Amino acid sequence: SKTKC
Amino acid sequence: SAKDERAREILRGFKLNWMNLRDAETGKILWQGTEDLSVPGVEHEARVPKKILKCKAVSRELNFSSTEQMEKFRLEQKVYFKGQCLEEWFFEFGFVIPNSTNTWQSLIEAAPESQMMPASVLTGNVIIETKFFDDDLLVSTSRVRLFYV
Ligand SMILES: *C/C=C(\C)CC/C=C(\C)CCC=C(C)C
């Protein structure tokens, strides 16, 4: 799970 | 009101002391707040430097005080863009000793560069909705509108 901001 | 009186007691005794966003690659603080953004019923605003969009990872640091014990303190955070959910995050702190002050650190990884939204599209259009829980019990919901500057 990564942020895209 | 039984669960509602307890939620109110927890909220009345709960305070965000300080919060930081740090570039995890350089160690540099990008953004720092001292305002209690756990406070519901107001649209908080935050300005963050647009270079945060180029960070591989951001270390989030929150320091909070709680008069009330919490069994399983946790956050759910929804990122809304012009009113549409883009991402939902879950963070667990766990047991909170009554009348303790606590530092809570979380490493938030950036999506691949090709997926990151431009500052000019994002700025002013992002709301972060944070729900503070003890286990199942909703204590507070707060909203922050984000500007990328
Ligand atoms: C890129 C932007 C990030 C990492 C999120 C910004 C969020 C805030 C500033 C405050 C929202 C979080 C809490 C109220 C704990």
Numbering used by the authors:
A (entry chain DDD): 1 to 4, 6
B (entry chain BBB): 2 to 150
Give the exact sentences the study uses for this entry.
Two cocrystal structures with the fragments identified in the screen were successfully obtained: compound-1 in a ternary complex with PDE6D and WT KRAS peptide and compound-2 in complex with PDE6D alone. In the crystal structure of PDE6D:KRAS peptide:compound-1, the asymmetric unit contains two copies of the ternary complex. In each copy, the KRAS peptide is present in a unique conformation, a phenomenon which has not been previously observed. To our surprise, the fragment is located deep within the PDE6D cargo-binding pocket at the interface of KRAS and PDE6D, binding adjacent to the farnesyl group of KRAS. In one copy of the ternary complex, the compound is at 100% occupancy, while in the second ternary complex, it is modeled at 50% occupancy. With only 50% occupancy, several side chains within the PDE6D-binding pocket are in multiple conformations. In both instances, the fragment forms hydrogen bond interactions with the PDE6D R61 guanidine group, Q78 side chain, and carbonyl oxygen of the W105 peptide bond. Compound-1 showed no competition with KRAS in either experiment; however, compound-2 did show competition with the KRAS WT peptide. Overlay of the two complexes containing compound-1 and compound-2 shows that these fragments are within close proximity to each other with a distance of 4.8 Å between the two closest atoms.
RAS is a major anticancer drug target which requires membrane localization to activate downstream signal transduction. Phosphodiesterase 6δ (PDE6D) has a beta-sandwich immunoglobulin fold which contains a hydrophobic pocket capable of binding to the farnesyl group. PDE6D binds to and sequesters the lipid of cytoplasmic RAS and has been proposed to deliver GTPase to recycling endosomes, which is followed by release mediated by the small G-protein Arf-like 2 (ARL2), allowing RAS to be trafficked back to the plasma membrane. The resultant lipid modification increases the affinity of RAS proteins toward membranes, where it is required for signal transduction. Here, we present a novel strategy for targeting RAS by stabilizing its interaction with the prenyl-binding protein PDE6D and disrupting its localization.
